[PDB]
Design a binder for this molecule. Structure first.
Ligand SMILES: [Ca+2]
Ligand SMILES: [Ca+2]
Lengths: 79, 76, 79
């Protein structure tokens, strides 16, 4: 039922992974992958405002660092 | 505070003074967000005051810094 | 620039063109803010041009790259 920020962040991440898991072959398609990533960021900020925490905030930024390490860090910058 | 670099140091020290006594709580994400927001507000207030963009490379180094010393070892 | 990825290379190449002649000043924070602000504005402009979110993963990889090659080892205050 989502009643604090930590569990909100889990909610956002879970929705994000549901998008990212089955499209591994396109993680470095920068234009395409910008959509689910936007939905992650925006979810993170939406729930930051809902719980009156600022944005960015440390948990949100750990989450953004985590996707960069697991999805994007070893992508080529030109396809 | 004669310039941006010394304003950034001023911001950074008001932040640490808030953070050092509450090491136990550095991974209480809700709580810790407050002093962190003050640091960002400070970094941005002084950026505009010295007519520099935000984010900017020095402000970003301060953000990496606090992630490295306060939040890196935290369970998510 | 036929797409976002090539837009991001134009931004990045223009940035390096301004940075390379001022290597002795990469740690002059107030000074080096100008070319960096232009880089961010360039990344955001083309982002909005191609109706992608900003920030986005590719743009963030460029940010990380300048932090790694330009600013990682600078003193936080000049002598
Ligand atoms: Ca805009
Ligand atoms: Ca779009």
């Amino acid at each position: 039922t989502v009643k604090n920020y930590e569990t909100a962040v889990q909610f956002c991440w879970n929705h994000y992974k549901d998008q990212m898991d089955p499209i591994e072959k396109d993680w470095c398609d920068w234009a395409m992958i910008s959509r689910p990533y936007s939905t992650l960021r925006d979810c993170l900020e939406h729930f930051a405002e809902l719980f009156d925490l600022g944005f960015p905030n440390p948990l949100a930024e750990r989450i953004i660092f985590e996707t960069h390490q697991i999805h994007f860090a070893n992508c080529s910058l030109v396809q």
